[PDB]
Design a protein around this ligand. Structure first.
Ligand code: FAD
Ligand code: FAD
Ligand code: WP7
Ligand code: WP7
Ligand code: CL
Ligand code: CL
Ligand code: CL
Ligand code: CL
Ligand code: CL
Ligand code: CL
Ligand code: NA
Ligand code: NA
Ligand code: NA
Ligand code: NA
Lengths: 489, 487
């Protein structure tokens, strides 16, 4: 019919945070929920869709594609264990990878769609949502607030959960460049590619492209500062740089693209600020992600933005307008799917259950699917050392024995535990090597239970594994004392 | 002749830890006896123990090696193309690379002895001459020539364990794990006998390296392999072994073995069935190695099954005589023997009594795919707690829908005391499981409840996060009885 529909909760953006909120409110609490997204399945023109950034063009397809990339290491490393086969026959078929990923993703899209069609009180609306007033969300045909109205949805409570978007720098020839969004759909793997950025996406893609490159290919990563993966453990930052270099990736630090132009053959010609040049078939920018707040017409209700650009929120995800909340990357804090999900669950417990609950943003475990991957939870030592008078660092680094037979001698596993040495409390744990993302998960539970180094040391090791290293350290390699590093007290 | 604070019989997992800790932490004078300096025939274990020479260390390399049979197949799902007809598994290369790694550790360990004050290695066979004297002889025979008499304040028994070989006719045409480590050729047809981890691990090893037309059979006298591990996991690992071409013969037991004219083995089971294979590997058990020690010289008591009786501080019935590791016939794991060794040394030579905790010890089976476990299985929990909840997740991860190994179900189970949420055990089957489970070991040392798991933020995408996404039991045990709803 031609009438608006009414809800307890309207959620704009059917992604990690919004889906957790909406499912919880409808199924745990009997609320009537509407959820809006721009697309029912992944890909061009809008990339993200039902299921969010993670399902469509994020965690899920990238993990698949890293898993694909790892077979290059596997097929080579097999020879050290006796495997023999015609090495000259090996090809990496990118198009098969992409078609397999696309169908996996589309199956989640269809699955999610089916759940909306079926679940009472939980409704999907296709289009672009924005705030018309504090109790009405309008759903339009495009992100232009002048496009046609498909629905008006009344809402007692409104959740903003539109996520983030790739930031593109304002350089000449930026139009010749792509983001991670387009990278997922490249018709063919680039012979030569530049990945611009030192963060997890650049690095992860650098390893994907490096395994699927055609014959005379070359992957280059550039970063404007001097060491990639700011925010992660420094030892690990240096080591993953070496290991990426060891597998044929050229890391360019202290380099930033100044312009891009097309060569007469149509390749991209990149000029760096230093006047170095590089010719490539693809330039993928991954220099950052920014909150998606522009299309919500927040000025219509006066929802405040932080100096930085995220929707401002309190610890309860509340904006300055009482019944309007924000969760996920739109708050511009930790841009991780399970953080968005925890925030959603906790919002809905607080507002609709009788159960106030704030997300804990500390001691969050995360991973980088570099090759080999990082697993990390809690504080890096230089941050810990500014908060706590005495810090101890327990460190074990070693090429594991499998990799002395596989040939990949450069694959050094690193395990570090950072403590408040005043009481043993584990402040952070940082891992580099095969299995690190899997090892770190239950370490997150330890940290939430305020584990001490002796709790780890007293646990009996599972042997032989990499993880047992965390249960074998009782003497600090070094310390920080009122901020200064020294091998002894 | 010669005087020591500590004489350790067996340079193995427990014995080395104890010997190291006594010499370097307490500045004691230590002698350590073992029968061989380097791995391999004739005594198999050597300096380093069973783990280093014919156990954890080389078995893991070999299972790593076997995993490629899967990785090579599964690469195709992700686009990888190559001539599969060209693929062959070179067992001899694997064996050589393994031998080299093990040999390096043997040498390294020798270097360590050579450079460590108060830590001496003696080659030979040790036994108890009297309450304070360890005789070191030429051979296992207690009548063979004396090489040494070591006087000792304190004597450590740490000679480990040995494969149990049943007394069936033709048992001498069978091998054990010791021999499996050195086979010249990968066996084309093989029978592994036994339901425990060593049988299962070797079954997956031989399965990957068998020549064309090959075939691994695993047999087990009872109805389901891997007793002691979680039941769902036992059933699922059986399915996953069968999917990868291993034939699992349950309720079958060899009654005899004969030699065929081609040098193969003819097996007859108790049921009358028969099977011809090239190698029959008996892995039905491992028994405490107490026989050459001459414990009767001083009257150290054995328990009924044959381990050296110990108290919780590793003390035998005779003052200043201790036993740790497999010889005590408890948990036969390397980190458990190390921990015993350490705790014993701190008690005897240090200011503080310390006893090893044998509960909530994390462990793995390097089956393909592998198991990780820590703490109680639900049937054991249900005889000791009135109200037990089980939380279970089981699904083929997406990566294995693409790889084409659709049979590879990941299983995560968490078993709780439902009266207060205390996690009593966690049980995993799937790639990464032994890695996942280590930090769960630490969790169980922190009174972790199911809600502590559940309120922790996942790392995505991993198999592990599955342990932080369960808050609703799948079923219960109330007063020992399995049901799906609580009263
Ligand atoms: C390449 C890449 C790899 C990643 N890998 C990981 C990883 O491995 N692990 C991890 O934890 N995190 C990963 N992330 C980050 C993760 O994807 C995000 O943190 C998470 O998806 C954010 O959840 P959200 O609810 O804020 O938004 P999203 O999941 O991004 O959902 C926002 C939704 O809003 C829709 N939308 C936008 N504007 C409107 C509008 N006006 N109207 C209606 N709908 C709208 C979008 O179409 C989208 O579906 C990755 C991200 C990227 C880009
Ligand atoms: C095939 C196999 C795989 C295994 N895999 C694992 C695994 O993955 N993880 C794990 O945790 N555990 C594993 N184990 C178990 C592990 O090897 C044992 O629990 C561990 O080695 C026990 O150490 P120990 O100190 O009791 O004795 P051991 O390490 O066996 O050492 C005892 C030593 O005493 C010597 N010795 C014996 N008699 C005499 C004598 N009278 N005089 C002088 N020396 C003597 C022996 O040569 C031997 O080196 C495995 C065992 C086997 C057989
Ligand atoms: C809880 C939940 N959180 C999400 C968080 C982020 C994303 Cl991207 C997706 C979900 C997912 C979801 C999918 C579709 C609509 C809402 C929520 N989702 C629902 C998943 N759901 C699990 C339980 N389920 C049941 O039917 C059920 C409920 C109770 C016992 O079984 C079907 C699928
Ligand atoms: C402690 C220890 N326990 C063992 C338990 C079981 C085995 Cl099978 C081997 C060891 C090993 C050892 C090897 C040789 C003789 C005695 C002990 N050993 C010493 C090996 N050690 C590794 C680390 N190391 C250190 O000095 C050290 C300790 C803490 C930080 O660095 C040098 C040698
Ligand atoms: Cl291709
Ligand atoms: Cl940059
Ligand atoms: Cl820097
Ligand atoms: Cl061979
Ligand atoms: Cl049996
Ligand atoms: Cl049984
Ligand atoms: Na509905
Ligand atoms: Na330990
Ligand atoms: Na010495
Ligand atoms: Na959780």
């Amino acid at each position: 019919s031609h009438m608006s529909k009414a809800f307890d909760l309207v959620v704009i953006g059917a992604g990690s945070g919004g889906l957790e909120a909406g499912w919880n409110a409808a199924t745990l609490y009997g609320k009537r929920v509407a959820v809006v997204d721009v697309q029912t399945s992944h890909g061009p023109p809008f990339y993200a869709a039902l299921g969010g950034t993670c399902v469509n063009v994020g965690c899920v397809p990238k993990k698949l594609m890293v898993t694909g990339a790892q077979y290059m290491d596997h097929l080579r490393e097999s020879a050290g264990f006796g495997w023999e086969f015609d090495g000259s026959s090996v090809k990496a078929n990118w198009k098969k990878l992409i078609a397999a990923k696309n169908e996996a993703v589309l199956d989640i899209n269809k699955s999610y769609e089916g759940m909306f069609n079926d679940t009472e009180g939980l409704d999907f609306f296709l289009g672009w949502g924005s705030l018309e007033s504090k109790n009405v969300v309008v759903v339009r045909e495009t992100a232009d607030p002048k496009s046609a109205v498909k629905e008006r949805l009344q809402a007692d409570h409104i959740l903003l959960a539109t996520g983030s978007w790739p930031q593109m720098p304002a350089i000449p020839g930026i139009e010749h460049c792509i983001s991670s969004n387009e990278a997922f759909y490249l018709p063919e793997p680039p012979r030569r590619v530049l990945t611009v950025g030192g963060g997890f996406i650049s690095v992860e893609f650098a390893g994907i492209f490096n395994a699927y490159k055609p014959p005379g290919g070359k992957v280059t990563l550039c970063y404007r500062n001097n060491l990639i993966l700011r925010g992660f453990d420094e030892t690990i930052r240096e080591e993953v740089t070496k290991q990426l270099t060891a597998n044929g990736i050229e890391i360019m630090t202290n380099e930033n693209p100044a312009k891009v132009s097309l060569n007469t053959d149509g390749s991209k010609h990149v000029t760096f600020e230093s006047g170095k040049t590089l010719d490539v078939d693809v330039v993928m920018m991954a220099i950052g992600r920014i909150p998606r707040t522009n299309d919500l017409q927040l000025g219509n209700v006066g929802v405040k933005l932080t100096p930085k650009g995220g929707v401002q929120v309190d610890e309860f995800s509340r904006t300055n307008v009482p019944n309007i909340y924000a969760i996920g990357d739109i708050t511009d804090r930790l841009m991780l799917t399970p953080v968005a999900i925890n925030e959603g669950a906790a919002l809905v417990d607080t507002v609709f259950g009788n159960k106030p609950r704030k997300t804990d943003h500390t001691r969050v475990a995360s991973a980088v699917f570099s090759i080999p991957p990082i697993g990390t939870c809690g504080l890096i030592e230089e941050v810990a050392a500014k908060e706590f008078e005495k810090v101890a660092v327990y460190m074990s680094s070693f090429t594991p024995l499998m990799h002395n037979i596989s040939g990949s001698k450069y694959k050094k596993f690193v395990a570090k535990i950072v403590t408040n040495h005043s009481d043993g409390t584990v402040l952070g744990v940082h891992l580099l090597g095969d299995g690190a993302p899997e090892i770190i998960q239950a370490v997150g539970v330890c940290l939430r239970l305020n584990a001490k180094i002796s709790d780890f040391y007293n646990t009996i090791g599972v042997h032989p594994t990499s993880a047992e290293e965390l249960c074998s350290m009782r003497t600090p390699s070094y310390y920080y004392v009122k901020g200064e590093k020294m091998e002894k007290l």
